[PDB]
Write a protein that holds these residues in place. Structure first.
Motif, PDB file in Angstrom:
ATOM      1  N   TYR A   1      -6.844   0.158 -13.336  1.00 27.45           N
ATOM      2  CA  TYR A   1      -5.717   0.194 -12.732  1.00 27.45           C
ATOM      3  C   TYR A   1      -5.717   1.485 -11.925  1.00 27.45           C
ATOM      4  O   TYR A   1      -6.466   2.266 -12.366  1.00 27.45           O
ATOM      5  CB  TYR A   1      -4.563   0.265 -13.645  1.00 27.45           C
ATOM      6  CG  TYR A   1      -4.646  -0.992 -14.438  1.00 27.45           C
ATOM      7  CD1 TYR A   1      -4.008  -2.273 -14.118  1.00 27.45           C
ATOM      8  CD2 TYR A   1      -4.976  -0.832 -15.935  1.00 27.45           C
ATOM      9  CE1 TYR A   1      -3.764  -3.011 -14.868  1.00 27.45           C
ATOM     10  CE2 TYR A   1      -5.060  -2.083 -16.613  1.00 27.45           C
ATOM     11  CZ  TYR A   1      -4.105  -3.111 -16.156  1.00 27.45           C
ATOM     12  OH  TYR A   1      -4.205  -4.311 -16.822  1.00 27.45           O
ATOM     13  N   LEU A   2      -5.006   1.551 -10.890  1.00 28.69           N
ATOM     14  CA  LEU A   2      -4.938   2.725  -9.814  1.00 28.69           C
ATOM     15  C   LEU A   2      -4.248   3.789 -10.753  1.00 28.69           C
ATOM     16  O   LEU A   2      -3.022   3.377 -11.315  1.00 28.69           O
ATOM     17  CB  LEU A   2      -4.294   2.420  -8.615  1.00 28.69           C
ATOM     18  CG  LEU A   2      -5.037   1.372  -7.637  1.00 28.69           C
ATOM     19  CD1 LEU A   2      -4.594   1.820  -6.301  1.00 28.69           C
ATOM     20  CD2 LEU A   2      -6.482   1.279  -7.827  1.00 28.69           C
TER      21      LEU A   2
ATOM     22  N   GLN B   1      -0.967  -1.382 -10.016  1.00 27.62           N
ATOM     23  CA  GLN B   1      -2.018  -2.196  -9.315  1.00 27.62           C
ATOM     24  C   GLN B   1      -3.506  -2.156  -9.790  1.00 27.62           C
ATOM     25  O   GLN B   1      -3.800  -1.136 -10.210  1.00 27.62           O
ATOM     26  CB  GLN B   1      -2.343  -1.505  -7.887  1.00 27.62           C
ATOM     27  CG  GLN B   1      -0.760  -1.373  -6.854  1.00 27.62           C
ATOM     28  CD  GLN B   1      -1.204  -0.934  -5.649  1.00 27.62           C
ATOM     29  OE1 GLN B   1      -1.224   0.190  -5.236  1.00 27.62           O
ATOM     30  NE2 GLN B   1      -1.489  -1.886  -4.665  1.00 27.62           N
ATOM     31  N   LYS B   2      -4.015  -3.475 -10.003  1.00 29.05           N
ATOM     32  CA  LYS B   2      -5.521  -3.503 -10.759  1.00 29.05           C
ATOM     33  C   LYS B   2      -6.347  -2.758  -9.729  1.00 29.05           C
ATOM     34  O   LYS B   2      -6.120  -2.925  -8.413  1.00 29.05           O
ATOM     35  CB  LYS B   2      -5.902  -4.917 -10.901  1.00 29.05           C
ATOM     36  CG  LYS B   2      -5.180  -5.209 -12.012  1.00 29.05           C
ATOM     37  CD  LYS B   2      -5.627  -7.031 -12.429  1.00 29.05           C
ATOM     38  CE  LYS B   2      -4.500  -7.467 -13.300  1.00 29.05           C
ATOM     39  NZ  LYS B   2      -5.135  -8.729 -13.884  1.00 29.05           N
ATOM     40  N   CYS B   3      -7.552  -2.298 -10.363  1.00 28.47           N
ATOM     41  CA  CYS B   3      -8.389  -1.707  -9.494  1.00 28.47           C
ATOM     42  C   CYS B   3      -9.885  -2.431  -9.298  1.00 28.47           C
ATOM     43  O   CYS B   3     -10.089  -3.010 -10.140  1.00 28.47           O
ATOM     44  CB  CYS B   3      -9.085  -0.347 -10.058  1.00 28.47           C
ATOM     45  SG  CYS B   3     -10.049   0.441  -9.137  1.00 28.47           S
ATOM     46  N   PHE B   4     -10.127  -2.470  -7.898  1.00 28.33           N
ATOM     47  CA  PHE B   4     -11.209  -3.329  -7.496  1.00 28.33           C
ATOM     48  C   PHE B   4     -12.314  -2.564  -7.128  1.00 28.33           C
ATOM     49  O   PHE B   4     -13.220  -2.876  -6.302  1.00 28.33           O
ATOM     50  CB  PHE B   4     -10.767  -4.408  -6.595  1.00 28.33           C
ATOM     51  CG  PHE B   4      -9.649  -5.049  -6.983  1.00 28.33           C
ATOM     52  CD1 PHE B   4      -9.572  -5.742  -7.888  1.00 28.33           C
ATOM     53  CD2 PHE B   4      -8.548  -5.292  -5.876  1.00 28.33           C
ATOM     54  CE1 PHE B   4      -8.552  -6.448  -8.400  1.00 28.33           C
ATOM     55  CE2 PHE B   4      -7.458  -6.098  -6.220  1.00 28.33           C
ATOM     56  CZ  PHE B   4      -7.280  -6.422  -7.471  1.00 28.33           C
ATOM     57  N   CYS B   5     -12.562  -1.033  -7.584  1.00 28.90           N
ATOM     58  CA  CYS B   5     -13.362  -0.037  -7.337  1.00 28.90           C
ATOM     59  C   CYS B   5     -14.990  -0.717  -7.604  1.00 28.90           C
ATOM     60  O   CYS B   5     -15.773  -0.335  -6.924  1.00 28.90           O
ATOM     61  CB  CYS B   5     -13.294   1.063  -7.819  1.00 28.90           C
ATOM     62  SG  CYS B   5     -13.623   1.536  -9.527  1.00 28.90           S
TER      63      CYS B   5
ATOM     64  N   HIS C   1       0.926  -1.292   0.035  1.00 26.47           N
ATOM     65  CA  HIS C   1      -0.011  -0.144   0.006  1.00 26.47           C
ATOM     66  C   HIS C   1       0.886   1.212   0.058  1.00 26.47           C
ATOM     67  O   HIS C   1       1.959   1.489   0.486  1.00 26.47           O
ATOM     68  CB  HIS C   1      -0.873   0.088   1.106  1.00 26.47           C
ATOM     69  CG  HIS C   1      -1.616  -1.221   1.260  1.00 26.47           C
ATOM     70  ND1 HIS C   1      -2.850  -1.230   0.361  1.00 26.47           N
ATOM     71  CD2 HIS C   1      -2.102  -1.855   2.390  1.00 26.47           C
ATOM     72  CE1 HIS C   1      -3.458  -2.610   0.836  1.00 26.47           C
ATOM     73  NE2 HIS C   1      -3.036  -2.748   1.903  1.00 26.47           N
ATOM     74  N   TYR C   2       0.190   2.373  -0.688  1.00 24.95           N
ATOM     75  CA  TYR C   2       0.964   3.640  -0.746  1.00 24.95           C
ATOM     76  C   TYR C   2       0.144   4.647  -0.154  1.00 24.95           C
ATOM     77  O   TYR C   2      -1.120   4.620  -0.237  1.00 24.95           O
ATOM     78  CB  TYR C   2       1.603   3.912  -2.163  1.00 24.95           C
ATOM     79  CG  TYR C   2       2.811   3.146  -2.370  1.00 24.95           C
ATOM     80  CD1 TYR C   2       4.078   3.778  -2.398  1.00 24.95           C
ATOM     81  CD2 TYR C   2       2.965   1.711  -2.772  1.00 24.95           C
ATOM     82  CE1 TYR C   2       5.133   3.156  -2.826  1.00 24.95           C
ATOM     83  CE2 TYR C   2       4.004   1.043  -2.718  1.00 24.95           C
ATOM     84  CZ  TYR C   2       5.308   1.772  -2.852  1.00 24.95           C
ATOM     85  OH  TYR C   2       6.524   0.980  -3.067  1.00 24.95           O
ATOM     86  N   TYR C   3       1.060   5.687   0.257  1.00 27.16           N
ATOM     87  CA  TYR C   3       0.256   6.665   1.040  1.00 27.16           C
ATOM     88  C   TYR C   3       0.782   7.960   0.687  1.00 27.16           C
ATOM     89  O   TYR C   3       1.309   8.737   1.746  1.00 27.16           O
ATOM     90  CB  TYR C   3       0.313   6.369   2.604  1.00 27.16           C
ATOM     91  CG  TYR C   3      -0.015   5.091   3.175  1.00 27.16           C
ATOM     92  CD1 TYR C   3      -1.464   4.753   3.292  1.00 27.16           C
ATOM     93  CD2 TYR C   3       0.770   3.930   3.222  1.00 27.16           C
ATOM     94  CE1 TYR C   3      -1.920   3.589   3.803  1.00 27.16           C
ATOM     95  CE2 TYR C   3       0.132   2.780   3.587  1.00 27.16           C
ATOM     96  CZ  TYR C   3      -1.043   2.473   3.864  1.00 27.16           C
ATOM     97  OH  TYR C   3      -1.487   1.109   4.270  1.00 27.16           O
ATOM     98  N   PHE C   4       1.117   8.301  -0.569  1.00 27.11           N
ATOM     99  CA  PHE C   4       1.606   9.701  -0.815  1.00 27.11           C
ATOM    100  C   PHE C   4       0.482  10.671  -1.282  1.00 27.11           C
ATOM    101  O   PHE C   4      -0.309  10.115  -2.143  1.00 27.11           O
ATOM    102  CB  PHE C   4       2.568   9.548  -2.086  1.00 27.11           C
ATOM    103  CG  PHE C   4       3.895   8.960  -1.652  1.00 27.11           C
ATOM    104  CD1 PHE C   4       4.516   9.345  -0.686  1.00 27.11           C
ATOM    105  CD2 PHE C   4       4.515   7.838  -2.137  1.00 27.11           C
ATOM    106  CE1 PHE C   4       5.820   8.851  -0.098  1.00 27.11           C
ATOM    107  CE2 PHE C   4       5.604   7.074  -1.928  1.00 27.11           C
ATOM    108  CZ  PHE C   4       6.418   7.738  -0.894  1.00 27.11           C
TER     109      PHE C   4
ATOM    110  N   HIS D   1      -9.303   4.340  -3.391  1.00 26.37           N
ATOM    111  CA  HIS D   1      -9.308   4.831  -4.948  1.00 26.37           C
ATOM    112  C   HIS D   1     -10.848   4.370  -5.411  1.00 26.37           C
ATOM    113  O   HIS D   1     -10.866   3.145  -5.171  1.00 26.37           O
ATOM    114  CB  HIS D   1      -8.302   4.496  -5.557  1.00 26.37           C
ATOM    115  CG  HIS D   1      -8.752   4.818  -7.024  1.00 26.37           C
ATOM    116  ND1 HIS D   1      -8.473   5.928  -7.663  1.00 26.37           N
ATOM    117  CD2 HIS D   1      -9.163   3.938  -8.035  1.00 26.37           C
ATOM    118  CE1 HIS D   1      -8.723   6.124  -8.827  1.00 26.37           C
ATOM    119  NE2 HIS D   1      -9.299   4.522  -9.215  1.00 26.37           N
ATOM    120  N   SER D   2     -11.465   4.935  -5.991  1.00 27.31           N
ATOM    121  CA  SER D   2     -12.348   4.738  -6.986  1.00 27.31           C
ATOM    122  C   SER D   2     -12.468   5.682  -8.191  1.00 27.31           C
ATOM    123  O   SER D   2     -12.179   6.703  -8.039  1.00 27.31           O
ATOM    124  CB  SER D   2     -13.842   4.892  -6.327  1.00 27.31           C
ATOM    125  OG  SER D   2     -15.102   4.545  -7.456  1.00 27.31           O
ATOM    126  N   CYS D   3     -12.934   4.737  -9.469  1.00 29.26           N
ATOM    127  CA  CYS D   3     -12.957   5.413 -10.760  1.00 29.26           C
ATOM    128  C   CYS D   3     -14.086   6.209 -10.780  1.00 29.26           C
ATOM    129  O   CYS D   3     -14.523   7.074 -11.553  1.00 29.26           O
ATOM    130  CB  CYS D   3     -12.733   4.367 -11.751  1.00 29.26           C
ATOM    131  SG  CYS D   3     -11.059   3.682 -11.837  1.00 29.26           S
TER     132      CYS D   3
END
Ligand SMILES: Nc1ncnc2c1ncn2[C@@H]1O[C@H](C[C@@H](N)CC[C@H](N)C(=O)O)[C@@H](O)[C@H]1O
Ligand SMILES: [Zn+2]
Ligand SMILES: [Zn+2]
Ligand SMILES: [Zn+2]
Length: 227
Positions: A225-226, A213-217, A147-150, A173-175
Motif C-alpha cells: 500500500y502507498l 491505495q494498493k502499491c504497484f511498484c 491521485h494526490y500531490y501533497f 511511489h516505490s517501496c
C-alpha cells in the motif's frame, strides 16, 4: 506507453489537444517556482581561477560549507557564475520524460543515464498553510480525486501540486526507490527537490518513497500500500 518531454508542457493549446487523445496527462497550471496561497513573513570556498575553470574543476562542490548546510549559494558566491551550488535557482534539472505507466497513471523516466546523488527536479506547487491544507484535503475527497500531490515542506507549509506545479508531480511511489527528497534553503526560504540515490539508467522510471491505495511498484519488498 506514450511519452512526452518537459518542454511539451510549455504549449497549453497543443497540450490540451494531446490530452484529449490520451497522449499527454490531464492539464494543470505549469509553474517555475512555488506560489504561496497565503504570503508569509555566503560560503568560504576559494574562488577558482580561469585556468581551473578551463581544467574542468568544480566550484562549490562537495566541500562547500553552504552545500553541507543544504543552503544554496547566492549571486554573491565567491565563485560567481561558476558556482555549482545554485541548482534549484538555475533550474539545473535532469533530462526526464513523462510516460504513461501500466497501472499508476503517468510517471517520470530518465531520458539519459542519471548519476547517483544528482538533482532531478524541484517539487513545485501551491504552498498551503494548515487551514488551507485542511480545506484542500476535504475538497479533493469530495471530488473523488484518484491521485494526490501533497508534500510536507515545514511547519505550516504543505506543497500541493494538484492544481499548479511542474512535472515533479508525476514521480511515482516505490517501496524500493531510486530517488529521495531533500529540503534546500534558497534565499532563506525552504524548497524541496528530488535527487537520485542510485545511478538510474536511461529509460528507467524515477521513483521515491512516499510518506488506502494498493502499491504497484513491483518491488520484491513491496509494502503493499502507498505509505
Ligand atoms: N506505486 C504506486 N502504485 C499505485 N499507484 C501509484 C503508485 N505511485 C503513484 N501512484 C498514483 O499516483 C499518485 C501520485 C502522483 N503524485 C503521481 C502522478 C500520477 N501517477 C498521475 O498520473 O498524475 C498516487 O496518489 C496514486 O494514485
Ligand atoms: Zn562554496
Ligand atoms: Zn557557491
Ligand atoms: Zn510497493
Amino acid at each position: 506507453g506514450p511519452s512526452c518531454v518537459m518542454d511539451d508542457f510549455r504549449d497549453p493549446q497543443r497540450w490540451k489537444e494531446c490530452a484529449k487523445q490520451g497522449k499527454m496527462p490531464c492539464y494543470f497550471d505549469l509553474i517555475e517556482e512555488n506560489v504561496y496561497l497565503t504570503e508569509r513573513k555566503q560560503c568560504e570556498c576559494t574562488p577558482l581561477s580561469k585556468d581551473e575553470r578551463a581544467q574542468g574543476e568544480i566550484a562549490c562542490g562537495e566541500d562547500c560549507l553552504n552545500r553541507l548546510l543544504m543552503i544554496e549559494c547566492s549571486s554573491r558566491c565567491p565563485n560567481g557564475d561558476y558556482c555549482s551550488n545554485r541548482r534549484f535557482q538555475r533550474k539545473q534539472h535532469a533530462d526526464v520524460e513523462v510516460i504513461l505507466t501500466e497501472k499508476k497513471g503517468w510517471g517520470l523516466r530518465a531520458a539519459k543515464d542519471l548519476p547517483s546523488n544528482t538533482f532531478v527536479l524541484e517539487y513545485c506547487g501551491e504552498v498551503l498553510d494548515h487551514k488551507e491544507f485542511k480545506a484542500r484535503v476535504k475538497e479533493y475527497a469530495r471530488n473523488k480525486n484518484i491521485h494526490y500531490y501533497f508534500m510536507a515542506l515545514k511547519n505550516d507549509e504543505i506543497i500541493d501540486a494538484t492544481q499548479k506545479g511542474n512535472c515533479s508531480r508525476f514521480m511515482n511511489h516505490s517501496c524500493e526507490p531510486n530517488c529521495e527528497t531533500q529540503k534546500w534553503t534558497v534565499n532563506g526560504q525552504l524548497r524541496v527537490g528530488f535527487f537520485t540515490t542510485k545511478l538510474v539508467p536511461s529509460g528507467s522510471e524515477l521513483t521515491f518513497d512516499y510518506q488506502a491505495q494498493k502499491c504497484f511498484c513491483g518491488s520484491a519488498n513491496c509494502r503493499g500500500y502507498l505509505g
